[PDB]
Design a binder for this molecule. Sequence first.
Ligand SMILES: Cc1cc2nc3c(=O)[nH]c(=O)nc-3n(C[C@H](O)[C@H](O)[C@H](O)COP(=O)(O)OP(=O)(O)OC[C@H]3O[C@@H](n4cnc5c(N)ncnc54)[C@H](O)[C@@H]3O)c2cc1C
Ligand SMILES: Nc1nc(=O)c2c([nH]1)NC[C@@H]1CN(c3ccc(C(=O)N[C@@H](CCC(=O)O)C(=O)O)cc3)CN21
Length: 496
Amino acid sequence: DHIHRVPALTEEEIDSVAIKTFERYALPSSSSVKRKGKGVTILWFRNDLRVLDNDALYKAWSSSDTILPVYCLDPRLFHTTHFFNFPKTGALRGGFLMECLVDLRKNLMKRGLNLLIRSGKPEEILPSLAKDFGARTVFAHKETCSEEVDVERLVNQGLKRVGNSTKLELIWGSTMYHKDDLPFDVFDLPDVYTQFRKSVEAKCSIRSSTRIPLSLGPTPSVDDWGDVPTLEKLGVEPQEVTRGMRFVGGESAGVGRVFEYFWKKDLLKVYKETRNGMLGPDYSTKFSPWLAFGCISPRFIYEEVQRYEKERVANNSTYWVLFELIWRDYFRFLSIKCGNSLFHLGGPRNVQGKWSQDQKLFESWRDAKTGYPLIDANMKELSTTGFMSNRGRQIVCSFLVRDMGLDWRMGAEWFETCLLDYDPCSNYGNWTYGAGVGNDPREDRYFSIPKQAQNYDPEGEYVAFWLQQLRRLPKEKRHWPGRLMYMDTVVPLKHG
Ligand SMILES: Cc1cc2nc3c(=O)[nH]c(=O)nc-3n(C[C@H](O)[C@H](O)[C@H](O)COP(=O)(O)OP(=O)(O)OC[C@H]3O[C@@H](n4cnc5c(N)ncnc54)[C@H](O)[C@@H]3O)c2cc1C
Ligand SMILES: Nc1nc(=O)c2c([nH]1)NC[C@@H]1CN(c3ccc(C(=O)N[C@@H](CCC(=O)O)C(=O)O)cc3)CN21
């Protein structure tokens, strides 16, 4: 078949939906906020590429009279992964990022601002801009993992080294439940998801999304706002989606997908019954890439769900989308409690010894040549589109770790290279769980390829779509085609 744009909306539809959505959440009046004499501030964007429900943007605006929005294309983002040195950012996510930047500049311009784009390290670019424009502060969202917090440290020290006079203000964001509202400090986050969930749902409230004014200007006088970099300048060979889902970067496209899934298609009311699907855009929200880049936020999604429940229907599916967003919150907070044990072979559980790093075995998994259609189709979906269904990710993870016996980080780093929605907290969090090195032993499980195939792809419709040489075969053969109609198997399945 062809490439399915996600969202499937036309460029005009995306623009009108974005306008209506921005309109719906616009700040009624800026009456009560005085900006006179507050000076210049720099807003440093990272993975919060949106205008809507952006607390850093709001705080920057309300504490200044002029804002200089900046995005730094950090050279380290295009180097290599930590342990196995795969590309740090694969071509597909890189392409999605560029679309996100183009859209952010466009949306900032609509509110009277613009986005200064520079290529280089934030700790070198920001202190320089702060001095040049006499900014009193640099606002940004707080991140949680080692690499990102190290950059925060370098930027903070860079600003001090040019004087006091300039402060880095990090704002908590990204989560549906706010860190400050939790019924426990993250150091004491429950190691069992169910307990974390029951606690926040019983003792916490979700904050309303932050309303942003329609007028946010002016910016300082800038001679060159910068071109959006090209992947080629960054040393990445562009790659386009040849088949399947083609996700469209940017906040505009993101709110367009929320509109598309919830309202236009009215699929939210059946979400829970379909979320284990693997084929097509319809089986789940597909919000992950926009959430990862911060093109959309969970507080916004929650308010849309509330409106849906009021106007259309409230049931187990409308609630389940929130259940899943809580999983995202959980791994984000867990990243703080775990620190770098999140990336260590033994994981947070600080487990065992073992594991092979057999390059040949790994490559067969990576290149979709394991000989098992269920596995191969998923790995091909990933390298072709930068996305994989949640069901598929759990399965390929179990296969790599349990059937192939490989160092789980090889799989985690490959996902890091390929996923449009790559998020360290969620990626490594879910990998530690699947690998059995997280701190909830009740989640340690082996996925039977035959059973999974039977339960989630009975007609072999999914593997057939991705592995066209199986399309002619009847089911039964689709999943056990044999070595001639398909290919040899690289390893026996660990469980009979
Ligand atoms: C090995 C492995 C690696 C993963 N890597 C990532 C990753 O790098 N980034 C990422 O965002 N998700 C990751 N996931 C979680 C989950 O598979 C994806 O969020 C989901 O497939 C994204 O598609 P969706 O938006 O249609 O999902 P939906 O089912 O529509 O869920 C809605 C939202 O809930 C959140 N969510 C749902 N399930 C999970 C989960 N298990 N953990 C965390 N958040 C969840 C996401 O933000 C998602 O967009 C991983 C899962 C596994 C098993
Ligand atoms: N977005 C993102 N953020 C990250 O921080 C991150 C990724 N992705 N991808 C995976 C890598 C690997 N992660 C790691 C892994 C190990 C240490 C580590 O062992 N640190 C030592 C101290 C420094 C040293 O001696 O190496 C430690 O004792 O914790 C740090 C970060 C950070 N990683």
